[PDB]
Design an enzyme around this catalytic site. Sequence first.
Site, mmCIF file in Angstrom:
data_model
loop_
_atom_site.group_PDB
_atom_site.id
_atom_site.type_symbol
_atom_site.label_atom_id
_atom_site.label_comp_id
_atom_site.label_asym_id
_atom_site.label_seq_id
_atom_site.Cartn_x
_atom_site.Cartn_y
_atom_site.Cartn_z
ATOM 1 N N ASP A 1 -49.866 -60.433 91.397
ATOM 2 C CA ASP A 1 -50.407 -60.039 90.097
ATOM 3 C C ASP A 1 -49.870 -58.687 89.608
ATOM 4 O O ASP A 1 -50.318 -57.617 90.063
ATOM 5 C CB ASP A 1 -51.953 -60.059 90.151
ATOM 6 C CG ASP A 1 -52.624 -59.670 88.807
ATOM 7 O OD1 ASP A 1 -52.013 -59.816 87.725
ATOM 8 O OD2 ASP A 1 -53.792 -59.206 88.850
ATOM 9 N N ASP B 1 -47.141 -59.663 82.841
ATOM 10 C CA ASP B 1 -48.268 -60.002 83.724
ATOM 11 C C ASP B 1 -48.155 -61.378 84.372
ATOM 12 O O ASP B 1 -48.400 -62.401 83.727
ATOM 13 C CB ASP B 1 -49.569 -59.866 82.943
ATOM 14 C CG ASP B 1 -50.786 -60.186 83.767
ATOM 15 O OD1 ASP B 1 -50.676 -60.314 85.008
ATOM 16 O OD2 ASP B 1 -51.866 -60.306 83.155
HETATM 17 C C1 LIG Z 1 -57.135 -59.246 88.091
HETATM 18 C C2 LIG Z 1 -56.689 -60.329 87.113
HETATM 19 C C3 LIG Z 1 -56.893 -61.739 87.672
HETATM 20 C C4 LIG Z 1 -55.905 -62.723 87.515
HETATM 21 C C5 LIG Z 1 -56.070 -64.031 87.988
HETATM 22 N N1 LIG Z 1 -55.029 -64.880 87.795
HETATM 23 C C6 LIG Z 1 -55.014 -66.225 87.854
HETATM 24 O O1 LIG Z 1 -55.926 -66.917 88.300
HETATM 25 C C7 LIG Z 1 -53.755 -66.913 87.389
HETATM 26 C C8 LIG Z 1 -53.761 -68.268 87.036
HETATM 27 C C9 LIG Z 1 -52.558 -68.847 86.630
HETATM 28 C C10 LIG Z 1 -51.378 -68.077 86.552
HETATM 29 C C11 LIG Z 1 -50.257 -68.631 86.233
HETATM 30 N N2 LIG Z 1 -49.205 -69.066 85.973
HETATM 31 C C12 LIG Z 1 -51.425 -66.734 86.936
HETATM 32 N N3 LIG Z 1 -52.599 -66.195 87.337
HETATM 33 C C13 LIG Z 1 -57.247 -64.399 88.649
HETATM 34 C C14 LIG Z 1 -58.288 -63.488 88.831
HETATM 35 C C15 LIG Z 1 -58.160 -62.179 88.361
HETATM 36 F F1 LIG Z 1 -59.178 -61.336 88.566
HETATM 37 C C16 LIG Z 1 -57.536 -60.253 85.844
HETATM 38 C C17 LIG Z 1 -56.982 -60.462 84.621
HETATM 39 C C18 LIG Z 1 -57.863 -60.664 83.399
HETATM 40 F F2 LIG Z 1 -58.444 -59.477 83.005
HETATM 41 O O2 LIG Z 1 -55.524 -60.496 84.456
HETATM 42 C C19 LIG Z 1 -54.741 -60.177 85.655
HETATM 43 N N4 LIG Z 1 -53.427 -59.983 85.536
HETATM 44 N N5 LIG Z 1 -55.281 -60.081 86.809
#
Ligand SMILES: C[C@@]1(c2cc(NC(=O)c3ccc(C#N)cn3)ccc2F)C=C(CF)OC(N)=N1
Length: 381
Positions: free
Chosen positions: A39, A224
Amino acid sequence: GRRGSFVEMVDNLRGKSGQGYYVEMTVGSPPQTLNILVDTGSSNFAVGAAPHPFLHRYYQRQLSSTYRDLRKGVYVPYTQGKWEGELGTDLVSIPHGPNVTVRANIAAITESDKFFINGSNWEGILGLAYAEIARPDDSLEPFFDSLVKQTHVPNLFSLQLCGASVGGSMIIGGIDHSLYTGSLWYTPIRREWYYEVIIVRVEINGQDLKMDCKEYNYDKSIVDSGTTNLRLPKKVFEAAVKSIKAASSTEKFPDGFWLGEQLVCWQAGTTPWNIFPVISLYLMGEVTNQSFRITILPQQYLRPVEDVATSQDDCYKFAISQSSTGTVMGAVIMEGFYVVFDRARKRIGFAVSACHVHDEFRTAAVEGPFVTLDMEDCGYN
Ligand SMILES: C[C@@]1(c2cc(NC(=O)c3ccc(C#N)cn3)ccc2F)C=C(CF)OC(N)=N1
């Protein structure tokens, strides 16, 4: 490898469509293996530490001789749900990454809501962004910072996200030239918090949106890997879909589809890709008045939804969506490109991905240079 080739790390990413990309990691001594979501949109290394029923496995601190308590907690809410954890440090390595072991901060997750995904195969999240957005504060050194400080691993990583099983590569401390074709093009990291960049111009099928470019970065544009969608500020989204609607008016679809309120299906093998426009983002270049252009296909923004049990057809989600947090260049963007997070040099490189899914007529593209004036005015303060 040391430069340009890192066979060890090629294909070190797995996942499922819409569930993100994860890398295998180990924590503690003896080493405990976990799948960890990659992430670039956050900065905490946080892992499941309790038997949540969705979890294949979790960090068992009691089993680790190298574990150290920081005697401090951390509460991390988001828009949809949260996690909460106990801070500590331990020895952390990446089996299919550099041949090193690092003492890193670990948030041992002890309570969560809408965080772990039911049916997913990851157990934590590796925040690859900077200390500024770390929780609880910027004194909690992010993993990549600890990696660079403790070893001789160069201060960069790169991501090839390939797109029910997805694959890709995270090249830690380097670039692998087999992962892309043509040249890398670099955009400056505006500020080291998120991977903030400035979008300078937007085109749909070559047609400029003709908006004040300040809009495109309202209040932020970031890269991201932890977000599926291309997320656009609502004003920009309105304009974008208006043009996407026009270029594709050869066909009609309900309004909800464009808002992702409903999904749209075609019969197996007959998706009208060619009815849908390419989308181009111009990014600030390395040189005064110079920019470059990255171009994605419908292949990137129209995503297969696989787990639709009330239909037998090929069903898709429109994965461009409005936002209050600014532009988010998620998987929709990144799956088209090899992306180089050149932390040493405060810049992000894009090149055509050797793995991006295309058709025989149109290809994802990275092109330049172009002349763009007043690129600084595109930033928001
Ligand atoms: C900390 C987090 C996060 C991100 C995720 N990501 C995913 O579940 C996910 C799903 C699909 C894809 C794709 N392709 C990428 N990430 C899950 C939990 C989560 F807490 C929070 C946000 C929203 F504010 O955005 C990002 N970049 N990271």
